[PDB]
Amino acid sequence: KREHEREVIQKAIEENNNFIKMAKEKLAQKMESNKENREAHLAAMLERLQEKDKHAEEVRKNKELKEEA
Amino acid sequence: MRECISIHVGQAGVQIGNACWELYCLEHGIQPDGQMPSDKTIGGGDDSFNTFFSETGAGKHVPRAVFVDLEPTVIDEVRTGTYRQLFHPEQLITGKEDAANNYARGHYTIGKEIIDLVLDRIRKLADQCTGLQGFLVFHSFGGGTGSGFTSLLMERLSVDYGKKSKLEFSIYPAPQVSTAVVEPYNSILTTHTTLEHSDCAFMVDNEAIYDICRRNLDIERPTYTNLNRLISQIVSSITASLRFDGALNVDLTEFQTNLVPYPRIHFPLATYAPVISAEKAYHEQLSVAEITNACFEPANQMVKCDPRHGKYMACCLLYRGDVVPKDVNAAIATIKTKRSIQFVDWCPTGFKVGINYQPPTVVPGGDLAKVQRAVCMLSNTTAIAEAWARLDHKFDLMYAKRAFVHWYVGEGMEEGEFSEAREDMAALEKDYEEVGVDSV
Amino acid sequence: MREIVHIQAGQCGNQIGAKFWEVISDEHGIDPTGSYHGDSDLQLERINVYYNEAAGNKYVPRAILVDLEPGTMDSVRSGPFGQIFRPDNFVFGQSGAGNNWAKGHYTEGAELVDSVLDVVRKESESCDCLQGFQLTHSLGGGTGSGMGTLLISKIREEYPDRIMNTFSVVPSPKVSDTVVEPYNATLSVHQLVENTDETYCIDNEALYDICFRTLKLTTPTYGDLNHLVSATMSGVTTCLRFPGQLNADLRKLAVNMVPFPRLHFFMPGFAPLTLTVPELTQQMFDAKNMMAACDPRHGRYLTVAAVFRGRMSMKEVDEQMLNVQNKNSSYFVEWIPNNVKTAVCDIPPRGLKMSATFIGNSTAIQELFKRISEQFTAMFRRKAFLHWYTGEGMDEMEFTEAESNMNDLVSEYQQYQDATAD
Ligand SMILES: Nc1nc2c(ncn2[C@@H]2O[C@H](COP(=O)(O)OP(=O)(O)OP(=O)(O)O)[C@@H](O)[C@H]2O)c(=O)[nH]1
Ligand SMILES: Nc1nc2c(ncn2[C@@H]2O[C@H](COP(=O)(O)OP(=O)(O)O)[C@@H](O)[C@H]2O)c(=O)[nH]1
Ligand SMILES: [Ca+2]
Ligand SMILES: [Mg+2]
Ligand SMILES: [Mg+2]
């Protein structure tokens, strides 16, 4: 009975610690995923705005080429 | 010892906090500067009010509270207001930009910039406590800070304080005063995310409070001040247990044992009586039996639902003021014989009752009459599930077309968190069905 | 403070922006020097949203005035309040655009853009907490529409996570004869669908029709059209400019109003056009009070904001807005609950004791996009006046993509108009 008393208190401490560990890990995986995802969407936004500057080069070029006929 | 720390988040949490702390100050004879003449121990003590108030050497009584918002304007009004002297500036924490009614911004994008600082200031209050009992967390379901920052904080609080108790007061959205179309989304996400981290949550349906102000106080178009004045009486009823003592006083944690039969089933329905104008209170003694009866009128409930069509798993009655046991017994006798009160079969008994002798208080220039005696009932009914069904329905109508989802995705969320939150709420609606079915 | 940076581009853009600044400067009680000479504190509580401080307690519009035509800069400077603006914020070209979009967007606009940008940054870097940008412009001319959009892309690149809000003046044959306007409007819309968060469609068609048909004005000037526009602009920015709950910043507004990122083009509405609350309310939902020339009854509202100004009963407002949604349930999509929000500001505008401003995201806005599309497809089919644009470096393909992106947008509004709760 003395060793069952030890087990029960060991089990409580273990579940409590576990709950803290899992919450700590769930949280930090969520903050990482969220950061990749957000950054990724900002990246794509900027790449698209780039390709606009590369079309506007290729337009202003197109013009100085037909303006030597 | 037995301290509680209150954390007030977002506009709703903050404004409700003001209302509560003013009420607590009047109840204890605390002045706006924090001085309390009747308190003869200076710099400290272990009196019942010290569960909520610390004391400085200079005889100041200071709320054990933190107020947090992602935007400064609501908290600036506490900083420059009637009660500015009461708080230490570092208990009033603000950012520059809000969550914009977006859970994702409160939980991640803006919230992550300020969470470490918030936990710090909380830590400084915990360290002043000889035997911390827990947290009381006040917030809206619908705002971005209220929803997303609160759930981040609850998560982090589980990490830094283990399983130290965390109780919530949550404002459930209503169309008359709502400020955002996506409130259903924020509601489901924060509820899903907070569910494992909270020991007990009292929902306040803004529509229900709104109605009570209109019906029982003849207020044509209630403001947040009308509502918060009412809410704070309910909160005061609940906390009075802790801030006072008396022979027949019964502690909030004892009610809790009875209110939560299962960790997920932790949402009690509150009801409060009497709510009456001065004009109608004049020459009207509301007896113990009358205020008790009022507890079982669904229109005095703070969440709209119908307990008459559900089953009770607990009834707790918190009487305050001029109440004695003989009258309570008679009152409850009457109700048992003449009302629809069906208990589940695994809870044969039943009702639990306490009395706080300290009389109810009202704020000057309020709409509430001052009464000799009052009661708050906390019951655990399966009917509170109706509140979730309605939200869940609003959620599904939008989610099916992904309306507004791109605002959340652009801040880093995935559709998988929406469906996961919603699944968790389906399960919770199922859990409230299962508890109510009879045993074999 | 949550600051907004204003940018007016072109003739339309500068006319209306000046009007806007006169109007609200009056509402906040500040004169053309820049001094507060007013009665109440409501006026200065959120004045930082639009005004910088200088010492000598001066208030300076956080505003940037832009045109390829040098003249418009003088008319502005001479106008009332012309001297309240910051002189370094005036940024003029010399050439002028002559209603060619590709000049504003791809060549002569591109030369000038960098120096507008310099002003924007300067203004952005003083901001405690920038919320974003609002641009006033037309889609028919060539500077306001073409350089206007280039700015939008350019700003969106340096400030991707800020809100980008346009007041875009849509073109009407009834107001301007300039045969090439449906090209500039289509190419602008192509840009706007991709790069703004919210755009108020201020339609010259409807401003004419209200001026002719309602106001009894036989031939109306810009000064009359714009009298409506300034009333509107003041109205839709009331929530940003005074204390309040609903839509108090550009982002909360985008979040309430834009359920799908591309579907961000609004019908504004105003009443009275020149009352009791039930009259204001019925009028503001009338097709005839709509600053875009669409009939709400030909589509469904995805979302709506509604703002009342004046001393009135809030109970009365609440009942009336309930009443309108009930009697008109069919014209609000059912799968977005509580999609109509209402605000009440005690401060009425000038000259009115009470007004109502409306902001709808209705699927009937495809009527406006279809009208342009018809006009545009009249030309492009018989490749008319195209040489003005191939001239400055463009390919035809781009004209096509701008076309099928605007038809795509029309069919998306249709698609959500047709959708049911099951
Ligand atoms: N009962 C009550 N409800 C309030 C109060 N203030 C706001 N609300 C409600 O709270 C919800 C909106 O969330 P807020 O608390 O304003 O938002 P927030 O927490 O500040 O989040 P953001 O402003 O988005 O950063 C809506 O349901 C409002 O009706 C208040 O003082 N009392
Ligand atoms: N409502 C309104 N529309 C205008 C005003 N000025 C010009 N417009 C319209 O704007 C379009 C021409 O653009 P404008 O600003 O003059 O061209 P830009 O200056 O070269 O960009 C036409 O369709 C005009 O009818 C104005 O003051 N008010
Ligand atoms: Ca003491
Ligand atoms: Mg807020
Ligand atoms: Mg021009």
Side-chain angles (χ1 to χ4, degrees):
Chain A
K1 217 225 153 302
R2 302 287 87 77
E3 110 191 26
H4 173 83
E5 302 158 11
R6 317 190 86 146
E7 301 175 350
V8 163
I9 188 144
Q10 280 297 9
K11 186 170 167 196
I13 288 163
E14 176 56 18
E15 264 148 26
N16 208 86
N17 285 349
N18 224 75
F19 166 78
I20 291 178
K21 161 230 232 289
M22 263 168 39
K24 200 193 194 87
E25 269 162 22
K26 196 197 209 86
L27 195 45
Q29 84 81 9
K30 271 197 319 182
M31 303 317 262
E32 206 53 0
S33 207
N34 179 262
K35 203 190 152 214
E36 289 181 13
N37 282 348
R38 213 207 160 204
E39 276 174 3
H41 287 130
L42 284 180
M45 186 171 327
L46 292 190
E47 179 168 338
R48 280 188 314 271
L49 291 177
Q50 245 49 308
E51 193 53 38
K52 281 196 165 296
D53 231 292
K54 203 233 156 183
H55 171 79
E57 285 324 49
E58 192 234 328
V59 151
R60 273 188 295 272
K61 190 56 196 254
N62 189 257
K63 183 218 189 170
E64 100 184 358
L65 290 174
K66 81 231 297 286
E67 278 207 332
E68 284 105 43
Chain B
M1 59 199 78
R2 287 317 206 289
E3 297 95 350
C4 305
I5 291 183
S6 287
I7 304 172
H8 304 272
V9 179
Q11 184 180 298
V14 169
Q15 294 185 152
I16 291 174
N18 282 326
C20 287
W21 287 99
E22 168 164 24
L23 192 58
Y24 299 161
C25 284
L26 293 170
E27 292 188 4
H28 294 295
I30 291 160
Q31 290 161 17
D33 49 10
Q35 291 296 314
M36 183 182 174
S38 81
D39 181 17
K40 305 309 183 192
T41 65
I42 298 175
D46 60 348
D47 290 318
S48 297
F49 57 82
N50 293 114
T51 57
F52 277 60
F53 287 97
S54 66
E55 312 194 26
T56 70
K60 190 173 285 203
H61 297 58
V62 173
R64 296 177 200 281
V66 169
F67 295 63
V68 199
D69 203 355
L70 299 193
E71 175 250 302
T73 71
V74 190
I75 285 168
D76 280 346
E77 284 307 78
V78 182
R79 280 169 189 143
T80 64
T82 293
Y83 279 99
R84 69 178 182 285
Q85 284 173 105
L86 207 64
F87 309 92
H88 184 280
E90 294 188 5
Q91 293 176 256
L92 311 186
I93 301 163
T94 52
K96 286 196 268 140
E97 191 185 7
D98 67 32
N101 291 317
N102 178 343
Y103 171 103
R105 286 175 61 86
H107 200 263
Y108 309 93
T109 309
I110 306 295
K112 71 188 176 32
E113 299 307 316
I114 207 183
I115 186 58
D116 290 326
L117 175 59
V118 166
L119 295 168
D120 251 64
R121 303 287 169 81
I122 281 155
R123 172 61 68 190
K124 292 178 185 155
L125 299 168
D127 288 344
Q128 301 195 323
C129 296
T130 52
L132 179 63
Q133 170 151 73
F135 300 101
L136 308 187
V137 179
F138 295 74
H139 66 106
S140 64
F141 276 176
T145 307
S147 59
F149 188 78
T150 301
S151 64
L152 171 73
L153 182 58
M154 292 284 275
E155 277 163 329
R156 289 284 300 267
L157 282 183
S158 286
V159 175
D160 304 7
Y161 298 91
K163 250 200 278 150
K164 195 126 285 190
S165 74
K166 299 207 293 296
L167 270 59
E168 275 175 276
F169 290 93
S170 296
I171 311 325
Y172 171 111
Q176 290 81 357
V177 280
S178 64
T179 50
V181 187
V182 296
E183 288 189 43
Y185 283 172
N186 296 324
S187 287
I188 270 64
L189 294 167
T190 191
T191 293
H192 165 54
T193 289
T194 286
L195 193 41
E196 289 162 296
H197 297 284
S198 168
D199 302 297
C200 186
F202 304 96
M203 297 192 279
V204 187
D205 187 350
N206 264 356
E207 198 179 319
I209 294 317
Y210 193 83
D211 284 349
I212 286 158
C213 287
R214 275 195 304 190
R215 184 197 332 111
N216 305 337
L217 292 179
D218 189 11
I219 297 165
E220 274 182 46
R221 212 294 191 179
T223 67
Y224 286 139
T225 312
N226 309 127
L227 304 187
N228 298 335
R229 282 169 170 180
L230 183 38
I231 289 155
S232 42
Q233 296 285 345
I234 295 125
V235 171
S236 159
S237 294
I238 292 149
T239 64
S241 324
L242 305 174
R243 308 176 279 109
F244 294 105
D245 237 326
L248 289 178
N249 178 48
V250 171
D251 210 74
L252 193 47
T253 72
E254 292 206 16
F255 292 121
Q256 262 185 259
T257 307
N258 283 28
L259 300 157
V260 196
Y262 304 102
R264 289 163 56 86
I265 305 308
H266 69 237
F267 296 93
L269 179 60
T271 307
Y272 179 82
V275 180
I276 187 80
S277 60
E279 295 83 317
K280 314 254 228 140
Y282 194 55
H283 297 338
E284 282 280 328
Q285 290 161 94
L286 284 155
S287 73
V288 178
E290 296 173 291
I291 62 169
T292 299
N293 276 289
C295 285
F296 295 83
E297 307 280 5
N300 297 325
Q301 286 169 182
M302 282 154 52
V303 180
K304 297 252 267 205
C305 59
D306 200 349
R308 306 177 293 197
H309 311 322
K311 294 208 201 173
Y312 285 90
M313 292 171 290
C315 252
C316 301
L317 297 163
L318 289 51
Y319 289 91
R320 75 192 295 180
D322 178 40
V323 189
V324 295
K326 172 184 4 72
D327 296 319
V328 182
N329 285 42
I332 294 162
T334 306
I335 267 142
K336 280 212 288 197
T337 90
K338 293 156 147 201
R339 297 264 192 177
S340 328
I341 302 182
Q342 215 91 58
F343 280 85
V344 299
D345 66 11
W346 47 268
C347 184
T349 58
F351 279 82
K352 168 174 206 93
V353 172
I355 297 178
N356 274 271
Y357 286 126
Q358 266 72 16
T361 307
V362 289
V363 164
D367 289 285
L368 250 162
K370 196 181 160 61
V371 294
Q372 263 183 132
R373 79 194 53 92
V375 63
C376 184
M377 184 163 85
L378 301 178
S379 46
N380 180 24
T381 337
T382 57
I384 195 89
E386 289 174 29
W388 306 130
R390 294 197 291 281
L391 269 177
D392 290 344
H393 184 52
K394 290 175 182 222
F395 181 102
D396 299 332
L397 281 172
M398 295 188 293
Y399 196 60
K401 321 272 181 274
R402 305 298 193 273
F404 309 98
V405 170
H406 74 281
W407 290 111
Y408 294 74
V409 176
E411 295 276 7
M413 300 188 38
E414 290 163 15
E415 297 197 326
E417 302 170 63
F418 279 69
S419 54
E420 173 180 321
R422 183 69 180 88
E423 268 155 32
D424 193 16
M425 298 295 294
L428 190 74
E429 289 194 46
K430 238 210 153 189
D431 290 340
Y432 275 94
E433 273 165 53
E434 288 172 15
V435 299
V437 168
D438 294 323
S439 313
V440 222
Chain C
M1 308 303 187
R2 302 297 319 288
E3 294 91 353
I4 302 174
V5 170
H6 172 81
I7 295 173
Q8 34 192 87
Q11 191 186 294
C12 187
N14 281 276
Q15 289 293 355
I16 65 192
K19 290 304 191 205
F20 168 77
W21 284 107
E22 278 152 31
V23 176
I24 73 176
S25 311
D26 164 61
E27 281 176 25
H28 294 276
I30 92 156
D31 67 30
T33 79
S35 304
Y36 174 64
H37 263 81
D39 22 20
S40 167
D41 261 337
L42 282 243
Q43 276 177 321
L44 301 178
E45 219 155 294
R46 310 189 66 206
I47 201 136
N48 331 83
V49 168
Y50 276 105
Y51 289 89
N52 286 311
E53 280 175 23
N57 315 17
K58 269 248 136 37
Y59 293 96
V60 182
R62 191 172 311 96
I64 295 162
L65 302 94
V66 170
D67 204 347
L68 296 182
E69 282 299 318
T72 57
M73 314 286 298
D74 296 286
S75 20
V76 158
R77 227 177 277 97
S78 79
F81 295 90
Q83 299 297 311
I84 208 170
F85 299 110
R86 227 181 133 258
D88 317 63
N89 293 15
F90 291 75
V91 173
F92 43 60
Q94 71 252 192
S95 292
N99 315 331
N100 176 343
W101 188 83
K103 272 197 172 104
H105 195 79
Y106 286 129
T107 67
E108 303 179 25
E111 277 152 35
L112 192 63
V113 74
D114 295 347
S115 43
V116 180
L117 287 186
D118 277 28
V119 181
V120 176
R121 288 179 207 101
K122 198 216 156 69
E123 283 281 4
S124 291
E125 288 190 60
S126 344
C127 290
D128 197 20
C129 195
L130 185 56
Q131 29 170 331
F133 310 91
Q134 70 180 38
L135 167 72
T136 37
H137 70 136
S138 52
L139 307 185
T143 301
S145 71
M147 196 205 169
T149 56
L150 181 55
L151 276 137
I152 286 161
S153 282
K154 246 65 170 87
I155 293 168
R156 161 137 304 197
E157 197 167 350
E158 288 189 23
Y159 299 99
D161 63 336
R162 307 283 96 210
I163 290 300
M164 180 63 70
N165 172 31
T166 75
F167 293 78
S168 302
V169 173
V170 160
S172 194
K174 295 184 203 160
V175 170
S176 154
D177 313 52
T178 305
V179 160
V180 95
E181 291 192 11
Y183 278 140
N184 306 341
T186 293
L187 300 150
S188 288
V189 164
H190 187 63
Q191 298 300 304
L192 293 170
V193 70
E194 305 274 325
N195 298 130
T196 65
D197 292 313
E198 52 208 8
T199 290
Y200 302 96
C201 297
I202 305 293
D203 194 346
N204 268 341
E205 194 123 331
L207 295 174
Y208 196 69
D209 300 358
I210 293 163
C211 280
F212 186 52
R213 286 135 55 152
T214 295
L215 296 173
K216 338 267 259 180
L217 286 161
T218 164
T219 50
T221 42
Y222 287 138
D224 294 333
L225 297 198
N226 302 353
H227 190 246
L228 300 177
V229 174
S230 75
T232 291
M233 291 188 47
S234 182
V236 307
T237 68
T238 302
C239 286
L240 311 172
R241 290 192 288 105
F242 304 102
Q245 280 304 269
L246 181 64
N247 298 329
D249 70 50
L250 287 169
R251 193 188 298 282
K252 279 182 172 167
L253 176 70
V255 172
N256 284 339
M257 296 295 307
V258 184
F260 302 94
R262 295 158 56 82
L263 309 197
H264 63 256
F265 299 94
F266 312 155
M267 309 202 352
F270 196 88
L273 294 168
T274 32
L275 282 192
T276 78
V277 173
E279 283 162 341
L280 277 170
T281 302
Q282 185 125 354
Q283 259 171 59
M284 105 197 292
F285 279 80
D286 200 346
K288 292 179 188 187
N289 294 54
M290 301 303 173
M291 302 306 166
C294 307
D295 187 1
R297 274 145 209 97
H298 294 155
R300 283 198 227 267
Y301 290 114
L302 305 175
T303 54
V304 170
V307 197
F308 300 67
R309 317 186 55 184
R311 311 181 94 263
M312 68 193 87
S313 161
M314 204 173 294
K315 174 172 153 202
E316 189 155 43
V317 174
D318 289 349
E319 290 160 358
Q320 287 313 311
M321 294 298 298
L322 284 175
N323 189 22
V324 157
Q325 293 159 83
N326 285 317
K327 294 187 181 150
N328 297 270
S329 83
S330 301
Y331 307 112
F332 294 93
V333 293
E334 89 231 71
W335 47 273
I336 306 191
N338 309 101
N339 62 352
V340 182
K341 303 292 157 208
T342 295
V344 165
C345 183
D346 306 304
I347 311 318
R350 206 185 217 174
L352 288 182
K353 256 162 63 211
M354 55 195 93
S355 50
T357 315
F358 167 95
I359 313 179
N361 187 345
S362 165
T363 60
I365 201 170
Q366 74 179 285
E367 283 182 337
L368 186 134
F369 295 122
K370 270 160 152 183
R371 183 188 85 210
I372 292 317
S373 186
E374 207 174 38
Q375 291 164 354
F376 167 106
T377 212
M379 297 169 215
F380 187 79
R381 73 145 110 82
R382 75 202 211 288
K383 278 133 280 186
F385 291 87
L386 219 66
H387 66 268
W388 297 155
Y389 307 93
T390 32
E392 300 275 8
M394 277 161 76
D395 151 25
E396 264 172 4
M397 210 172 60
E398 186 172 340
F399 264 76
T400 305
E401 287 166 26
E403 189 182 40
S404 53
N405 197 15
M406 203 170 70
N407 303 333
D408 274 12
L409 173 74
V410 168
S411 60
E412 284 154 29
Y413 277 109
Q414 188 53 37
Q415 171 197 324
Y416 290 118
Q417 176 176 320
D418 288 335
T420 54
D422 267 296

